[PDB]
Fold Engineered Chalcone Isomerase AncR7.
Amino acid sequence: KVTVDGIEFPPTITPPGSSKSLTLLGAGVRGIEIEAIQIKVTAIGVYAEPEVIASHLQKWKGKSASELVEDDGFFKDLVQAPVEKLVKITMIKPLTGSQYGGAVEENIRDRLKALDKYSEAEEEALEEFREFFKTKSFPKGSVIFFHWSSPSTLQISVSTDGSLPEEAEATIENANVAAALLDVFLGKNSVSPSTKASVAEGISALLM
Ligand SMILES: [Cl-]
């Protein structure tokens, strides 16, 4: 397990609507700082299938956690790897659905605009993202499951109490939004350098 801010991230999770078990790569915290005030917003865990994802990362074999974490190409390879992925979010700071969703939407939208990959299709995908989160509430301990069921298919499920949903609650089909959301966590300018640091540890260990 990796414990973050008192929150357990277990070694394995089965995505909602899925039967396949995914394994923990790493976990960390998303914190914000302004005028020296630090606030922990969420904890983040990243899951995939160990040997399947090791199969796409053999060029990083033998490398240490220190080596991997400072190589941007490493995280790029991980975002791009066409394998099943899951990101679990556990809420630390209480947020409304609109609050949480609006910020991740903005992050994705800004990333796509920077790449000149924000067009009508992506706009509609992010409107669906918005529609989904608008009806939700995120008290402390609530959870979000972002599941990459295909490289271009994002499933979202939530629970207010930390239970594991039985099914994907929303499905968004758009390759650019799906990759951009991964980059929110694993890209340059990640919301969580700690999560990246932990994933580097996990994959370094995994590539023996
Ligand atoms: Cl988050």
